[PDB]
putative hemoglobin-like oxygen-binding protein (Pseudoalteromonas haloplanktis), 124 residues
Amino acid sequence: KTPYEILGGEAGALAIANRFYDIMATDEYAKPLYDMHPLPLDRIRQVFFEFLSGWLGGPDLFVAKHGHPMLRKRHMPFTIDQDLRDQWMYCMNKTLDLEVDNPLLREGLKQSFGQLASHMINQH
Ligand code: HEM
C-alpha cells in the first residue's frame, strides 16, 4: 500500500499541504520562512498539493502540469540555510503528527522529508 493510499488519497494530500501552510503562516519560529512567500498562498497551497499527490504515489499532478520536480534546482532562486531548513521541518513535523495516524508511515515520512529539506540547503 502506498503512502497516498494509507493517508486516504487526495483528501489526505490536500489536508497535509493545507495544514503545513496553515501552521507556517502563524507560528512565530517560522515567520522567516513564511516571509519568503508572496501572498496570498492560494497557488502554492495548490502546487504543493499537486506535488504531494505524486510524491506519495497518487496521480503525478505536478509532473503532469509543471514537469519533473528537480526540487533542488527549483529552489535555487532562493537563499536557503540550515535555519530555514529547520523551520520547514518544524512545520512539516507538526503537520505529520496531526495528519498521519499510522506511526510507522509517520516516522517514514518525517525522515524522507527531512532528507529532501536538507538537499535544498544552498547556503552554508
Ligand atoms: C529549507 C527548505 C525549504 C524552503 C525554505 C522552501 C521554500 C520555498 C519557497 C519560498 C518556494 C516558492 C513558492 C512560492 O511562493 O510560489 C518554494 C516552492 C516549492 N517548494 Fe519549497 N522550500 C523548502 C523545501 C521544500 C521541500 C522539502 C519540498 C518538497 C518535499 C518543497 C517543495 C516545494 C514545491 C513543490 C514548490 C513549488 C515549486 C514550483 O512551483 O516550481 N520545498 N519552496
